[PDB]
Design goal:
homodimer, alpha/beta, D-Maltodextrin-Binding Protein, domain 2, five-stranded mixed beta sheet, three-stranded parallel beta sheet, 8 helices, 12 strands, 20% strand, globular, binds arginine, binds zinc ion
């Protein structure tokens, strides 16, 4: 007596092209969206997305506001204490600073300067722990961070290379800084889909679906589309 | 520190084949090597006919098998498979260009394939008016086709497509087979049923490999 296909409710933060972002007609799109839709199709489910701040996603997941989270989210040990992750669906990569082109080369060069980043991220934890001479400025959206960079309120913005690279396409006055951050205490954990801790049946359905999606020519094409 | 011994059948470009330097190469070779790297293991290959791989795996001749092998129900009774590492796709016949259009047109004719394959079982069960000619090796089947001893060779679209690139007198037949009862299961790495510790390591390795940009590049190398 069901009157619709099962619907899997995903939480995300659509501030982060090419992983997830909002297009011209206010629709959520990106690599993660294509992945989640493909997973839902394998599960014979419809997909629903809720867009909210990145730092609120794990808490809302735990509060049962949605079934799963996909948001370019590294499977860190800290997050693994709070949620259950799927198998990695994509690799965790190196973090970069974007600054005015030629203005900074290294983290040392940023001594005493303001660098914007997102609340709740690997990037925030890395800068706070390992680059204490730099002032981290927390935002609930990389979009506000970029605005503040362009208005000279910040000297840099620190995030995933794909996201920064994407932003740079429309901002040639800026450049990825030479020194990158790769510390494996912070970086290199794969991207995962998160579910609540006591939700193994759903998690294993998601894993079984990812096994299939990741073996598909379409999944190679998703990477080609979003990461080239 | 460790070696993983794979059994394969290097008769099936681009999955696995012998190149002009007498070395075994291909998509499956790259995948198995990547799996071995994640497991911090050396990679070793044994080359033998496709229909002997599973009996040999059970006999403990090697640890695993990778050979563009579909994960069929009949095989799962005999061995354990990893998660899929590539999709099982459509099967096609190659013939002299324009000579045949449908399986119906091949009535009472000889069509080559490897023994023990999905393609064999589909022909025998679904195209009984066609004579199956079972080979140990696709290489020999192709040779017979060029020598007019067969009317067609029946196999996976990538392998047939790859052979075609150097044989322009031939063509993929109009009617293709993708019957879900024989095709579409997905390719697996096979291990022995009582070797679940090894199976779990390979699955954990594949989880990482399949999440990698390198694995997308592998497909772009071998399938485009
Ligand atoms: N949708 C987003 N805003 N994602 C931000 C992710 C940043 C980084 N990859 C992390 O795991 O913390
Ligand atoms: N290495 C080979 N000769 N592989 C043949 C595979 C043919 C077919 N995909 C099967 O599973 O039966
Ligand atoms: Zn729900
Ligand atoms: Zn749109
Ligand atoms: Zn917040
Ligand atoms: Zn798994
Ligand atoms: Zn061995
Ligand atoms: Zn034989």
């Amino acid at each position: 007596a069901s009157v619709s296909a099962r619907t899997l409710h995903f939480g995300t933060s659509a501030t982060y092209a090419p992983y997830e972002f909002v297009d011209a007609d206010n629709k959520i799109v990106g690599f993660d969206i294509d992945v989640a839709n493909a997973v839902c199709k394998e599960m014979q489910a419809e997909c629903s997305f809720t867009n909210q701040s990145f730092d609120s996603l794990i808490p809302s997941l735990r509060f049962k506001k949605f079934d799963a989270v996909i948001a370019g989210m590294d499977m860190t040990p800290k997050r693994e204490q709070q949620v259950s992750f799927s198998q990695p669906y994509y690799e965790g990569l190196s973090a970069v600073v974007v600054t005015r082109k030629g203005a900074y080369h290294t983290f040392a060069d940023l001594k005493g300067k303001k660098v914007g980043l997102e609340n709740g991220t690997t990037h925030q934890r890395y800068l706070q722990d390992k680059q204490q001479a730099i002032t981290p400025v927390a935002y609930d959206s990389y979009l506000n961070a970029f605005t503040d960079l362009k208005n000279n309120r910040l000297e840099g913005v620190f995030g995933d290379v794909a996201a920064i690279g994407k932003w740079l396409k429309n901002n040639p006055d800026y450049a990825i800084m030479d020194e990158r951050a790769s510390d494996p205490d912070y970086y290199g954990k794969g991207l995962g889909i998160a579910v609540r801790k006591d939700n193994d049946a759903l998690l294993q359905e998601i894993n079984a679906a990812l096994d299939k999606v990741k073996a598909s020519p379409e999944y190679a094409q998703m990477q080609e589309k979003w990461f080239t």
